[PDB]
Paper text:
[name] is a member of the erythrocyte binding-like (EBL) family of proteins, which localize to micronemes and use Duffy binding-like (DBL) domains to bind specific RBC receptors with high affinity. Two crystal forms were observed, a heterotrimeric complex in which one [name] molecule binds the [name]-RII dimer, and a heterotetrameric complex containing two [name] molecules bound to the [name]-RII dimer.
In this structure, two [name]-RIIs (DBP1 and DBP2) bind a single [name] ([name] A) creating the heterotrimer with a total buried surface area of 2241.8 Å2. In the heterotrimer structure, a new [name]-RII homodimer interface is created by a translation of 7 residues covering 12 Å along helix 4, relative to the unbound structure. In the heterotrimer, residues H262-T266 make contacts at the secondary interface. In addition to the dimer interface, each [name] binding site, one in the heterotrimer and two in the heterotetramer, can be broken into two interfaces: a primary [name] binding interface with one [name]-RII monomer, and a secondary [name] binding interface created by the second [name]-RII monomer. The heterotrimer and heterotetramer could represent [name]-RII binding to a [name] heterodimer or homodimer, respectively.
Residue numbers in the entry:
A (entry chain C): 19 to 30
B (entry chain A): 210 to 254, 265 to 370, 376 to 464, 467 to 508
Amino acid sequence: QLDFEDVWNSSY
Amino acid sequence: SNTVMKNCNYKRKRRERDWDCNTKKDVCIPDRRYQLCMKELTNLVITFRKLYLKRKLIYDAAVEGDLLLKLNNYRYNKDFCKDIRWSLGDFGDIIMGTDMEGIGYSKVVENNLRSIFGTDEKAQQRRKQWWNESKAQIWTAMMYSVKKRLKICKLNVAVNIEPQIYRWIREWGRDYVSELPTEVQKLKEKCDGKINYTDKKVCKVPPCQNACKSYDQWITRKKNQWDVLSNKFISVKNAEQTAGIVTPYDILKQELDEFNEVAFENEINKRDGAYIELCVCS
């Protein structure tokens, strides 16, 4: 249920 | 791990399943490790292959982090920060190829990683390098839900690299310390005091006898787990330097608040005062 794009951009 | 989807959807409750020392004889595996979310790492078929790996790892890590937060009832506290640390560490060993579980889908992931970084005698160095470059971002990904969804965890401590056996001993110690008072409480409730002017209850009272048997079984598992883990530590240490840590006990002393080596060994060997008082007729 996690949005990959938001996760990717949040991880940096 | 013998499952791939389910463990990326929910986690068994804490200490629902004890450490497993039977699957691989020379190590004990915690249930958290068995359930580590690796769905994306599993189902994936140069500088770009590494990039695709990064995306998959980021996503598995964010899900793992979220599920660990949920396992902790969404409490943002020490238990959560430690779990994040343990799972991050395991991801690291998986990437580096120094993970000790090696069961089921973990073998598929290792094959995938060998397909990526190759298998020559400098591959291991490259994998360690890639991990060191990526680990901070992987930790950050695990904290995604805490940042975005939730309404004190320290990166530096989390990303600092140590052998898996060190970390598992820390996690084991914290489990032990949580379990002991609970198991003792169950004992006292049934076995405290005497059944007559002279005999402890355990001498004649079946509920107390059952309670001592259950405690015996629990403490026997703890002893076995410490035995296996502490010896894995020694064999790993002999085959590999960490300032401040010489013996497996040093890990417990540094991880735990109030550890005492003699008392601990008394406990796991059923010669501590409390156990004798409650469970030894004469």
